[PDB]
């Protein structure tokens, strides 16, 4: 076993090839499948796994009642091989958690699981399944983290956590973790910024995170930093707004776009020079549809012009959270870090007449060969027998 | 790990010994078993696996509704150990696909999964579960492939794909793939020929494929080629017609036999000099029964005489697709490549009054010791509780 | 990996310690558990597994209907770790079979599975899951075998098969198998003897089998042989009759005991000099209860006196088949071959008012430390919801 | 593989971080989950496992009827990865048992499973799944053991067993076990003491056990011993009484506290010099709630003052058994033995109107970083559909 270098650049990509689809909700109609949300993908040098937050209950069972609720003592972080349904019969237990992150440094898995009360939550860090550290809420207001993979470079892994209001100024910290131990942290000096649920990836020995402004921005905030946690911050400038909800496309801003800025959804983007690959819902008002857009000057430019659009989920179909994940050369044999992404397909409450809320997933990887747009939706027929 | 040589000849065989039976549909009446079709077997130097195209749903669940449908965003290629039922709890995810192929080169698994719209489908190639290449539809008319194992020789794997009409002249291409990367391809110059769903096997460093003419041939077309993709084409001459539907046996043709030539079923045959082992349905008009026939001059001779017939499935029982698979000396310890075959036993629509369509499987391997004919049918009692 | 020596003697034992219990029928009431019969245990140098003949159906499902039937194309030999329920989710597929045997030579598993028509059945032999040989019925009357583990000595494995009437003189053959290949066989010259379902074990480089006389013997026939298949035959002389049905205990015979001699049940015994450990039902008329009896001169003596009796299953509880299995020094680290045994607990038809027949299992190993008698019955409550 | 040294001291700890939660009962409402009680955790140098005593039945099935019953022939010791639900599809079979213990010596698993009649029960010892020894009841009155992990030091493992009345003076023995073989035992000379269900852990090459006085003590008895079984005995002196039921906290005793002394619950404590970490229910009269208390002089001091209290389960929630388990440096890479604990959350009879009784589990590990109290209850809604 050797630790991931993380020193190569992102692979340039022209399109996205479908990588996985689990059909979790369809199968859970009869099969024993966990009620889950906040799924994400992360890979080791050997395999890729789907991580997810269970509700400690199964689909089509009475205990799925009220699962629109975000935090409870019953939620646990678990994982299974990519593309398989999250079942009690194929899932590895990771941590007790209602907010989480995970990543592999080349040697072992790091998992971060936050549980406990809203006014004093504690993140439990595990390395190879052994508790190695903890960090407790510093603002006493729902300590929370990525809900996607952390990023590793030369034996160090990095994540971002938030503590404070979800509708106003909060506090944001970056962490450097080695063998499950926090070796350094810094609080971001980001007045008037809002960071939630960051999607972080490694690129040329540094980390880039694209996050969610739940306070007053319909474009996405970003933070980038080196291994010493020296950071820069900003917002994606493109007039192709990335959050949901959001305004119709027009002239963007390199600061938070106030129009339709409140609320949001976890998302991601990949930076290539001044350009950006943007993943976003198709609807401006609800979590419906999904598309990938290549905007060659969208990181720093404010116009609403773009070069490529690829359909992922039809506008009449439910989507939800999305996040980045990468495949290192140690896994692929390539000379660059390959960008991939996943999409959570949320079914149930609040928009559908069920007693439960749960999601399935799809994932794609970036390639330079031919690709095609389509719609790969959840496909479940609601309501269920339980309702 | 070492590459399969694929340079020895096919083992001569006098009969077929039963190798596996999964009873998938019988078990799916209660258990959690995928709705599937287009199953096939492929082996590594260590194990044999059953691959299959799920419908992203389980038997006896409402989501099995309308699974007579061939192509959808929900279909996925998965695999499980041979003889086991295809379940969410024992199946490995391979690819998102409504048409597929797979094979092992001695080092890693190659999988090919085609998804996307009918007018621009994309084949995604994976090597050891990592995307290594893609190929997009070139005729914009349902890019499709074998639905059985590809064939590997000295580190190169080979497959055939079709694009264009299924009821007239189409386009057929042969591919050479190394470590999941397409290194060469050629379009077959085959006017008045039709190739669908090829069953390909290695033999003395070259590849032989026996396929399905869905246009105007009740005998089977074949294509053989060396590692450089230098090919030959023809039709099996035997008056023992191999396709379904077909006419009663009589004088055959070395070209397409037009009588009952439209439509068909995936099948296979093994060539031994001028002779051929033919696997076929027992019924000339429907997918019922199965039998193996040895015809000592059937590859090139047009008479309807044969030497050996072995019963596999009774004529009053449902059958379906069939395909070849081989076991290499690297797996068996033999000095030749052993021929085996599988049969898909289709239940449900359109011939049965259910809301669903699904199949189970049986498989056999060629031996020179004593064997016996019998009937090993699906055995499920329809309809089910869901209907 | 090294082949088992099989050259040491049986470990002397004073009693039997419970080793496993699967509770299959109890669990199958809700869980997905195969309908099975004819289970048996066999061990490798690393683990012990339960082999069994499925009916290609699950408990409490309609396809369990009529499973009193012995032979069908749907029956398959499968295996799982000892003590676990036989489920589609934890069972390895072995062979298509309605009669079977299996054993490990120290290097790989040998399995023997008989399927096909009653008038021409074929035994398929597999070594490490690869077909290595076949043997076809020679009397055209239900070729059949042990339904328990074969016996291995220095790289050779041995079994017994029967072909012919089950109610009169039949034909019995011994086989020597190396790496799945039959290298020698001999037909036993046994006029007026009847051998069915032999329980065979290795002891001092030779094989001893205790079997079932279904024709006209209420005591058990035996056959012993060396690696060259030079054999001796006889019947257990003890007045403690071992079969079921049988007469009340009295003066025995070294030939077949005609009284209540027709019919029978698979059983076993362990020979120690002139002494014998006898496992048998508690009832003389039905498959109820089970007990182990140490009879210090019972192999050759005809009296009905014994020294030790240990209860295994209460007389008011269902039992069924029983068989021997051994643990070699290569597995245990002992300087002798340890004797163990299993008992099949049959539930359902014909004695119970259900539509199905299925069994669970218990097993015990011989020790020289303290033990105790008790009753470890199936424990299921019949009928089931399916009936 | 190398033997665990067990020669380092316990890691000092300031609080407890949550390690696992299985949600077994919630999931068993639909999924196939064993009815269990008496769960416990034990680790090897590679992984941690949950052991448990099944009732040979699944939740929400009719065979769960009457599972308040403690001892039957159907109960089995099985294990699964920590945090996973105990299911037939993910559980390893260990032994037939209605009382049990297990631990890993660094090389292999030792399991101890007691079954048989109340008047002559037999403990079966297995090393790497092979029977290595047995010990039979010496008082003919329910031979019984820890219901938690045994303790290993330098290749020797240690446990405590009890035989005799559970409501008066009984007999208590300490055992030293090497490779599954009992090499030494001693009967504790403990007049007026009562020992049940000991929680034992290694510390500086010696063993410390904290147990349950079911006769006449509301504080917990303890026994400590070296590898030669030279022992000391006493009771925890703290006025913070550890058993359930118990009186309100007040002046304690270094002998058995008679007030509310009859009956009790399995529990644990960790000794640090004169101090003690006490785990106990929150209710003084029933198995409700759970908390960890640090009492700096509680081992030898009788006052009712303490320094730290951490909530684990709310007082309005069901708890049950609790036990210690440790993680050795060979597993963690630390320079000390890390203390952890588990809690059984019992649902059903006798306090709830169901036909069944079963439990789920949570576990925590000691750390010196920040922690938080909360409530992590079972969370199931009773009754179930079966009742
Ligand atoms: C998922 O959760 C939902 C929400 O809880 C749940 O729907 C609810 O079911 C309960 C129980 O049937 C309903 O509660 C009843 O409401 C009526 C008025 O509509 C009251 O009169 C009832 O109270 C009477 O009866 C009680 C019990 O005998 C007495 O204790 C009480 O004093 C009264 O006599 C009772 O409260 C509730 O109305 C619904 N809510 C909604 C929005 O439908 C649903 O059943 C859950 N689904 C599953 C599968 O668990
Ligand atoms: C397990 O198998 C058993 C045995 O087959 C099965 O019990 C049987 O169920 C069938 C179907 O209900 C019964 O068959 C009927 O018998 C009656 C006389 O009792 C006949 O009148 C019926 O025939 C009429 O209806 C048919 C269908 O419409 C017509 O085709 C026919 O011409 C007549 O009009 C019919 O044959 C049978 O009586 C029972 N047998 C016993 C012994 O109970 C059971 O249902 C199976 N269980 C499961 C779970 O599958
Ligand atoms: C508490 C702030 C946070 C970010 C805005 O809220 C989230 C919004 C979510 C959503 O918009 O779907 C669901 C989340 N599981 C949640 N996180 C937690 C810890 O509750
Ligand atoms: C589209 C042409 C093709 C070959 C004739 O049709 C097939 C016939 C099939 C059939 O005759 O059963 C079902 C197939 N799954 C299918 N392949 C795809 C891709 O839909
Ligand atoms: C056919 C002869 C044979 C031995 C008497 O009958 C058996 C009796 C059995 C029994 O007495 O329970 C059930 C068996 N599964 C069976 N074997 C086969 C192959 O059918
Ligand atoms: C027989 C004495 C013993 C300890 C007091 O009783 C126990 C109390 C238990 C309890 O208080 O919950 C349940 C146990 N499973 C049990 N142990 C056995 C073996 O039946
Ligand atoms: C990337 O990391 C590897 C491994 O340490 C190193 O050998 C290599 O020089 C680095 N590549 C570049 C371009 O710096
Ligand atoms: C087949 O390939 C093997 C491995 O390269 C080689 O050793 C052998 O000579 C070849 N056999 C023939 C007949 O060419
Ligand atoms: C099957 O599909 C048809 C067409 O939509 C629908 O009417 C019917 O309700 C479906 N059946 C089930 C059981 O869902
Ligand atoms: C097999 O492939 C290797 C690598 O390309 C090549 O060197 C060798 O000649 C090939 N063997 C044969 C028999 O063609
Ligand atoms: C048993 O077999 C072993 C392994 O071959 C051999 O070394 C040994 O001598 C044999 N033991 C006896 C008692 O013959
Ligand atoms: C503990 O045991 C290890 C392994 O034998 C040994 O190296 C070490 O010296 C011991 N530690 C102490 C403090 O005795
Ligand atoms: C539970 O056991 C009692 C006593 O035998 C019995 O009356 C009742 O029917 C059982 N309940 C179920 C659901 O089996
Ligand atoms: C550990 O056990 C070994 C083998 O018995 C022994 O030689 C050694 O002295 C022991 N170590 C300690 C620290 O006692
Ligand atoms: Ca926003
Ligand atoms: Ca732009
Ligand atoms: Ca089920
Ligand atoms: Ca045709
Ligand atoms: Ca011919
Ligand atoms: Ca008889
Ligand atoms: Ca005698
Ligand atoms: Ca007490
Ligand atoms: Ca104190």
């Amino acid at each position: 076993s050797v630790k991931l270098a993380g020193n190569s650049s992102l692979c340039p990509v022209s399109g996205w090839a479908i990588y996985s689809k689990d059909n979790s909700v369809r199968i859970g109609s009869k099969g024993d499948v966990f009620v889950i949300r906040e799924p994400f993908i992360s890979c080791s040098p050997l395999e890729c796994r789907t991580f997810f937050l269970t509700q400690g209950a199964l689909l089509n069972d009475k205990h799925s009642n009220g699962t629109i609720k975000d935090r409870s003592p019953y939620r646990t972080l678990m994982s299974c091989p990519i593309g398989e349904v999250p079942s009690p019969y194929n899932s590895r237990f990771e941590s007790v958690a209602w907010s989480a992150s995970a990543c592999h440094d080349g040697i072992n898995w790091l998992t971060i699981g936050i549980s406990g009360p809203d006014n004093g939550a504690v993140a439990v860090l595990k390395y190879n399944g052994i508790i190695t550290d903890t960090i407790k809420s510093w603002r006493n207001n729902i300590l929370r983290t990525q809900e996607s993979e952390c990023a590793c470079v030369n034996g160090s892994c990095f994540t971002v956590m938030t503590d404070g209001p979800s509708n106003g100024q909060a506090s944001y910290k970056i962490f450097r973790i080695e063998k499950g131990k926090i070796v350094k942290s810094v609080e971001m000096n980001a007045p008037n910024y809002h960071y939630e649920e960051c999607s972080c990836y490694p690129d040329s020995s540094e980390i880039t995170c694209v996050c969610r402004d739940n306070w007053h921005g319909s474009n996405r905030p970003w933070v980038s930093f080196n291994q010493n946690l020296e950071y820069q911050i900003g917002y994606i400038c493109s007039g192709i707004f990335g959050d949901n909800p959001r305004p119709n496309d027009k002239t963007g801003s390199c600061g938070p776009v106030s129009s339709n800025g409140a609320n949001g959804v976890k998302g991601f983007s990949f930076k290539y020079g001044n350009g950006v690959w943007i993943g976003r819902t198709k609807s401006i008002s609800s979590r419906n549809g999904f598309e990938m857009i290549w905007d060659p000057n969208g990181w720093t430019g404010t116009d609403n012009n773009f070069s490529i659009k690829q359909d992922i989920v039809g506008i009449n179909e439910w989507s939800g959270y999305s996040g980045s994940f990468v495949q290192h050369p140690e896994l692929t044999g390539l000379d660059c870090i390959r960008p991939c992404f996943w999409v959570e397909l949320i079914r149930g409450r609040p928009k559908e007449n069920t007693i439960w809320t749960s999601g399935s997933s799809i994932s794609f990887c970036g390639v330079n060969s031919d690709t095609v747009g389509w719609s790969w939706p959840d496909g479940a027929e609601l309501p269920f027998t339980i309702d």
Side-chain angles (χ1 to χ4, degrees), chain A:
Chain A
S1 296
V2 182
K3 51 187 175 181
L4 303 176
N7 65 334
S8 68
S9 301
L10 277 184
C11 305
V13 303
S14 58
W16 308 89
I18 193 164
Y19 192 52
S20 72
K21 186 181 202 306
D22 54 21
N23 289 308
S24 300
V25 184
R26 284 168 61 90
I27 295 172
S29 183
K30 170 179 177 179
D32 297 336
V33 176
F34 284 117
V35 174
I36 72 158
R37 263 216 63 200
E38 299 87 23
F40 64 90
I41 304 303
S42 195
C43 306
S44 69
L46 295 177
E47 70 168 358
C48 294
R49 304 183 61 82
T50 303
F51 291 79
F52 47 87
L53 297 180
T54 75
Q55 291 278 14
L58 300 183
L59 283 168
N60 233 355
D61 178 74
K62 68 176 186 177
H63 292 92
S64 69
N65 210 339
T67 43
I68 189 179
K69 180 171 167 56
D70 285 309
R71 306 174 300 282
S72 85
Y74 317 115
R75 305 207 69 175
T76 60
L77 176 72
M78 306 187 75
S79 69
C80 65
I82 189 176
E84 301 185 16
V85 298
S87 172
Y89 317 136
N90 76 332
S91 297
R92 172 153 67 212
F93 176 86
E94 304 289 357
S95 189
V96 183
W98 43 250
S99 182
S101 178
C103 53
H104 202 282
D105 66 358
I107 308 299
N108 285 128
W109 281 105
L110 167 65
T111 60
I112 305 173
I114 301 168
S115 193
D118 285 356
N119 68 358
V122 169
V124 175
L125 287 70
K126 292 179 180 182
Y127 191 67
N128 195 28
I130 302 301
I131 296 179
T132 44
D133 214 346
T134 67
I135 179 274
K136 189 170 186 177
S137 180
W138 65 93
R139 293 295 185 93
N140 295 358
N141 195 356
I142 316 177
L143 176 65
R144 53 198 185 267
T145 191
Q146 296 183 247
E147 322 295 11
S148 61
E149 76 170 0
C150 29
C152 298
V153 171
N154 190 28
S156 298
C157 297
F158 304 85
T159 190
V160 178
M161 303 191 195
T162 300
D163 201 342
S166 62
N167 66 341
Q169 184 76 60
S171 175
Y172 331 106
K173 288 188 175 181
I174 311 170
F175 296 86
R176 175 177 169 169
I177 304 164
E178 297 174 10
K179 298 192 172 304
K181 177 71 76 293
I182 299 173
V183 292
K184 192 176 185 178
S185 67
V186 63
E187 177 172 2
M188 292 156 53
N189 180 45
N192 211 48
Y193 283 72
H194 200 252
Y195 290 83
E196 302 271 19
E197 302 169 334
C198 289
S199 292
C200 305
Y201 63 88
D203 178 4
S204 301
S205 295
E206 301 188 6
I207 310 302
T208 299
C209 300
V210 175
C211 318
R212 163 183 174 177
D213 176 336
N214 210 58
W215 174 15
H216 58 195
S218 49
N219 53 339
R220 297 200 175 279
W222 59 262
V223 55
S224 64
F225 50 92
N226 59 26
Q227 295 169 68
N228 283 344
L229 304 191
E230 298 171 336
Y231 65 83
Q232 298 183 270
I233 58 177
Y235 277 76
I236 297 177
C237 300
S238 177
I240 300 86
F241 308 117
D243 209 353
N244 181 265
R246 62 174 184 267
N248 285 311
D249 291 343
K250 60 174 185 178
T251 302
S253 177
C254 296
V257 176
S258 58
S259 181
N260 302 98
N263 207 340
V265 69
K266 176 181 174 65
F268 74 93
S269 291
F270 292 108
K271 177 184 185 294
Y272 288 88
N274 298 85
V276 59
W277 268 108
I278 299 173
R280 70 173 185 176
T281 66
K282 283 181 168 298
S283 168
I284 68 174
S285 59
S286 55
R287 296 172 174 184
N288 303 7
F290 203 83
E291 61 189 12
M292 292 298 292
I293 293 174
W294 168 241
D295 182 351
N297 73 339
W299 194 263
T300 53
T302 59
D303 66 80
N304 66 345
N305 302 124
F306 58 92
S307 297
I308 308 175
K309 174 186 289 185
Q310 180 180 351
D311 290 350
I312 300 297
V313 176
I315 191 172
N316 291 146
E317 307 288 351
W318 300 109
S319 58
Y321 277 19
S322 60
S324 57
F325 72 97
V326 297
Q327 298 189 323
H328 287 248
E330 286 84 355
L331 173 65
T332 65
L334 299 168
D335 67 355
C336 53
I337 297 171
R338 161 178 285 176
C340 303
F341 73 91
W342 52 262
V343 185
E344 173 197 41
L345 312 174
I346 306 174
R347 301 305 302 274
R349 288 291 176 179
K351 291 239 181 180
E352 298 181 284
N353 283 147
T354 56
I355 68 177
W356 54 272
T357 297
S358 194
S360 68
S361 74
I362 53 181
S363 74
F364 297 78
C365 282
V367 299
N368 283 309
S369 47
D370 288 344
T371 54
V372 71
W374 207 28
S375 180
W376 290 273
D378 176 72
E381 272 237 352
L382 277 53
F384 279 7
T385 44
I386 200 71
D387 281 31

